[model samples]
Target chain A: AAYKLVLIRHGESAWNLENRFSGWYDADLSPAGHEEAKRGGQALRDAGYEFDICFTSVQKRAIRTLWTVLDAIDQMWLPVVRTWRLNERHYGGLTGLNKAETAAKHGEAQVKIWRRSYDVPPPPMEPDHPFYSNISKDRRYADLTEDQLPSCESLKDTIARALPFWNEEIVPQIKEGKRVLIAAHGNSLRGIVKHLEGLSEEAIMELNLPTGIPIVYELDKNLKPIKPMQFLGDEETVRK
Target chain B: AYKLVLIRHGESAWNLENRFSGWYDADLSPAGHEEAKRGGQALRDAGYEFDICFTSVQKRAIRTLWTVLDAIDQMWLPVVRTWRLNERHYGGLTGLNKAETAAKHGEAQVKIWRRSYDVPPPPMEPDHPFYSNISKDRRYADLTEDQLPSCESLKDTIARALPFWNEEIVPQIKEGKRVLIAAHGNSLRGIVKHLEGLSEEAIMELNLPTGIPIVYELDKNLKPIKPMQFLGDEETV
Candidate 1:
């Protein structure tokens, strides 16, 4: 009935420096990103997080982050589970737009609403948009329903895909007393946290998840959270 | 059925060079040297025994041949089939490092020249400076097709390569003699193209990384019936 679950956000991106909203697009990690992933691995090694199983979103950033972590642990040989269900909240038409430019054009209030409002998605990109519209019909996307493919999403929509995965995949592992680690994106983490902590919709909306933090959660026999989750890194580090 | 085999040399400095190596000589990567040891071990571990050995005169092919034979404790067997089972000649572009080639000619065009099927580079003339040295080599004195000093496309490689495959390799497999072919990347591609019946464009993308032995189990007809299996632990890939 008791379980230890660890969640770590992925490292910084090339887009992160430019302050752009990176949805489900594929991009390699920057050098600083790799260092951050290693730092998370070092923290886990220092804290002793040898996992029974690991999962990541279908993203090179998340996939490669876990690779580095497992590589450091000498457990890169372990079987991995990847799914697109745990991707970041899609930024819609604002995906490649700079944050400052967006704020200036749309006004800070509207931009804030788009960034923080849980239910409001940004302007949906056309199916012909360069980023997601031309997604290859590879085997990877075969399982995607028509609704899931080639479209942007709200934070609420992210939860809709992610929470089902939590109930079906993650929660059961925790309930079995197995230690689990989920390497995922920002809103995906928020979605999982919302399920774990029983946070209200509005309460979840107010919470901001920092990048590259290994937030650990401890649960009791009834599977209710017994202790408050602890955030990694100091105040200044999280402020960025 | 017992069969002849061809193993490409481990990754070379030229393999790393990103340029076409053709007949040029280059050393193995540090990891490639270690992989050569493993490739030999795979043959030994799998309990493959050979009657005689064959190798390109090129050192990269020759070195791997020695390592693998030594692994099976067969270093004493004289190399019986030494010839030009090297890569297609990358005329005029040979001997340059990959980065330098990329910098000088631009990457996309260099990539096109190296990987395209029919677009062979400029040919080498019979009277060219390098041609005299190549033709006079004792290995090719009696061979009829040894006169040219030009580049070879993958298709052209198969033409020259299959004769050795048929004349030298098939007969041994028929007589129940296990033959090991030590060849270059392009030459091995020619062999694999013949065996698998892959198209030229498909063959262009075929890359044998380094020192990994792809064991093809053959039927009595000397045709491969079993899927190609890579021999190594996870770390090697």
Candidate 2:
């Protein structure tokens, strides 16, 4: 049996418009983000893709994106699981600062090192940081022990956390032949993709995913990829 | 240990026009949608948050919950949809307005059916759109023919809805997971009756206000601590 899996980075966020590092900000979708999710859903609808279940981060931008996708496809009734593990990589000190400004202050190379590098994490956030305060008190995260909360996360750190949930909560569902959809952030999604494709650091960095375009990965019964995972839409979809 | 809150869906197109909307999928009217907005805003203003939400598969209930989540900024909360929480099936009386039902069946007879606990309406014919819609609906694919209802007395609706409440929802509440339920009239009535242990005649007469949030506090035994309330002030309640 083959399992169907689709992943899409959430549509743009409020900080996304400001070019700020939105990591773990809980920013909701922008108006354009709303429409972007719809288009992706419409494409999946046209292709006759139906899902038995969906997963999303506790963050609203991804959750709202999934909502729009399910609405567009008229499948709002599907079961959805929202987990903090699927959240965006925590930017720590860079949480809300404009990326270009950060690049200007700290050289572009340093920013890229913190951003795209698999092993490097940015400076840690203190307890007073707005993102930290919000998340610490956030009832959703209350059940998670203190160690479970991340003060800073590299792609490596993200993958370490993401893999467990994907393996424990998600893999069994797919193995049961459930059609799955995941609406999440770029780096966390990259973490999953890197795991699935066994990508090296350099190759994974080169694999930049555009927001809102759906990527499909077809897997066999043994959980091996039947074909190279690819984006679902046309040249225009790939271009964006 | 905690409070449980439930909201009946806002007035639907069928309800506003005095039609029997049961199982017909009548969507909310404009004012009805505003009613949902009001209910959502109320929850937001009160600072009541939820970890998970529950609703019937009906659009009116789901949309009501959607509006509420948007208002509360808890759109990320997990939601479970079950057809067991759906409005009572009206059978052959599916889309008839109040007056039509009154004229077709004697007015007193209509009242007796509406107010009765156990009398079911005439069974919907298999060929009717009402029956066909249920048969073709993908959401009900999990249900067997026996599980699907052709017509239901209020008692019959209660019999089916209780299984999901006792088995699925009660367990979550016991675990201290906050819950918000967006559902319909009779199905909700069944739940209220079960929680409060109301007399059959009393539940039949207990008309719940549409679209308002009702909060119930259960004691240690999961019995109600006090009378369940439909939100504030005398003018409306």
Candidate 3:
């Protein structure tokens, strides 16, 4: 008997299929991601989770996912706001490169350490990487000042970026009694979850959020959860 | 020696192909519209008309055209603000229906008079019109209030909507020295052109704007044109 907040990570991305590091890589939804998002939206629809507004990263993966969900719910006319704040954690140079090879090149020990540590960030992404067009020259980031952009970021840095919009833009809307939905990346969602659920840095570092599954948090008046977040549909499917 | 303004009507819509009334129809770019927009964008690129911002109607045909331009301009990352004011002129009950049949039903003589008159709107589109879903159920309009919507709209009503954005939003941005481009439907662009070129009401009624063509008008400090708007290219193409 509390207010509801819904969140879903974008489904499998093209880079996810090849197993790449995608921080701010602007990957498209894989065909599978499209199908998964459709079903995830239907689950919310059938469950009666209505939204007054939706927020998403400007990146296509999440934008496309939000679009699919809106269509499935027949809420395509819904007002949406897209901002850079919800984009995936900036991976710096690691993004757009193949994951397995990166571990071999950077050393698996170093790679594993970064994931397990909250303060450390990946090496800065270079301007000459072939996939560098994913951001450096993107017009989507045109409004963003140079300082607003990340050369590379720790999970902590991602939270600093995502949480502002959550606090300033989202909180006011939610407190006003408007239902909200957020579609974003794993790390971006992770950072948001850390703040929302009051997780410590260490607890959130290893916390896993499966993609394309609806996660609902029932909140008390102040927006704190009364209970742990619940996943929609089959646990078996969410794990996959 | 003047500022530049660019305007475009959405390319070939499905309704244009089938010969139907499309006021606020939310018609998508037909294959031709997509191709035309891409080429139109390339032409703007080739011509070196760099824009700092772009504006478009929320309707698919114009929205898709704007998307195509940004991609071709490699400006897909460019700042774009979509507003309802840029939408196609609301034809109300006449939108989303076949043109041939509508005239026969409403009478060709009656239809002719409505088009010739700017103040006279088509009859109020009904709540039950098949194409009502094009607008009423659209989530895109979720922020719009009941009074802001049109049951039927005259050519004049559309200009009132389109001109406000031109004056209040686009004008302020451009006067601040930002270059701008706009993508919208034929009538919406028509209304805007009327205001910018200082055309009399009679001059606009017969003013023809072809689809998918790029129109550029060079302006002074106040945003009025020094010359008639010029189409981008191809007397022979």
Candidate 4:
């Protein structure tokens, strides 16, 4: 049987509205983002999609986004698995910086590389770095070994961490004929997409996912996409 | 060592207004959020940890468990939610302000309904203004019609809740998994009454304040070897 997987980037967070690099900053959804989450859920409901299981990142933005979506779908009781591995790419030293302002300071070309480059990591954040202090101290990641924590991560680095969850949890469930919804961050979703579609580095760098849009993938028995992934809305609105 | 922890959810909006919440699905008040955080902190500071977690389907208990798990950095723990852990069904009195209900129904009648171990209050009407008909709620969709409650006596609550403990939770505990339960005052009290072997009269006086962690260390037989301890050094019955 052809299986379906639904991927949703969390709704706009406070940082998204502020145009800042959120990257594990743990911001909640803005009001508009909340509405987007509801709308996303409605779209899935309209399409008659029902998931047997779901997954989300540990951050409140992603978790709350999934909560609103689940409420819309009337599936609040679906088993949910939350993992830090599904978290947004750590913005590293650039976290909390205004995107435009950072571009002005570091030159637009360099900033793009840092933002969209597959392997070019931003400078590592120090333990004492004020904005990144939570990364070192947040108890949510207390179970992670020191090596697992990241101050900053490139898209390549994001895939390295996020794919383990896909291979371990998500893939196994899909094989079991369970529909899965992954509510996560932009970079984390992008990482999964890159792995699933086997996107080239340049292709992955160009991918920019909008918030609160559900990307549906139909896969054959091999779990390889039977057709291209389709966004749940009009092409114009979903195009990067 | 096998251990069990019980936590009543923090104050709900109905709780703040002195209304009977029962299974009405009221959310936590702002102060209740603070209370939940403190409860989580107390558990964290006490170095308590669990492999599995449990909570009622009610939002207040679920959210309280989330806050506590977030506080303890254990958000990834497996959680099992059950209607069996829900608050005692308050029947027709649900959503009514306690003082006003007493004023209308007479304090003695209200007392008997509230304090009685076996006597259930008047059953809620199917068309009552505040009735949360579980038959239509998707969360309870999997439940059989008889499994849902419109009203219940404390004895009814004990009857409904004990099997969950004996079947689901007890077997997990016996397997050596530490368990955390976040539920309602009466449902928790029901468990306490059973575990401590309280008489019906003694159980009536048992009051469980919201947002406190009560810890118990049990012998192989699951009976408490030491008196239960509260996280904040409060007295334990």
User: In candidate 1, which residue ranges exceed 4 Å CA deviation?
Assistant: A104-109, A134-139, A232-240, B1-237
lDDT of 1 by residue, A1-240 (tens): 266777888888878878877887655578898888887777677666667667788666776677667655544424356778887777777777787778876898888787667788888766555665433343355568888764678888999999889889877777776668888888898898888788998888877776566777787865677788876555665446
Write model 2 residue lDDT over B52-76, tens digit each, in one string: 7889988878888988898888887
> What TM-score does chain B alone reach in each candidate, compared with the true chain B?
0.83, 0.94, 0.66, 0.93
Count of backbone collisions in candidate 1? 1
Model 2 TM-score (2 dp): 0.93
- Per-residue lDDT value at B36 in model 1: 81
| Model 4 iRMSD vs. native | 3.0
Best candidate according to DockQ: 2
Q: What would the per-residue lDDT of candidate 1 be over residues B99-207, giving only the tens digit for each residue?
A: 7667767888877876778777666566544565555654345557654546776677767778888788778778776677777887788778878888988888888
Q: Cα lDDT of model 1 overall? A: 0.71
**C-alpha RMSD of each candidate structure in angstroms:** 20.4, 2.4, 4.6, 5.7
TM-score of chain A of 2: 0.93
Candidate 4 lDDT score relative to the true structure: 0.83
- CA lDDT, candidate 1, residue B83: 51
**Model 2: residue A110 alpha-carbon error in angstroms:** 2.5
Question: What would the per-residue lDDT of candidate 3 be over residues B149-224, giving only the tens digit for each residue?
Answer: 4433345545545655566545644554435455544445444555465454544454444343343344444455
- Compare candidates 3 and 4 on TM-score and give the better one: 3
In order of lDDT, best first, we have 2, 4, 1, 3
Q: Give native contacts recovered, as a fraction, per prediction.
A: 0.00, 0.59, 0.12, 0.09
Residue B199 C-alpha lDDT in model 4: 92
In candidate 2, what are the lDDT values of residues A76-186, reduced to their tens digit? 778889999999998877887786778877898787667567778887888877577776577777778878888888888887888889999999999888899999988
**Scored by CA lDDT, what does every candidate get?**
0.71, 0.84, 0.65, 0.83
DockQ for model 1 equals 0.02
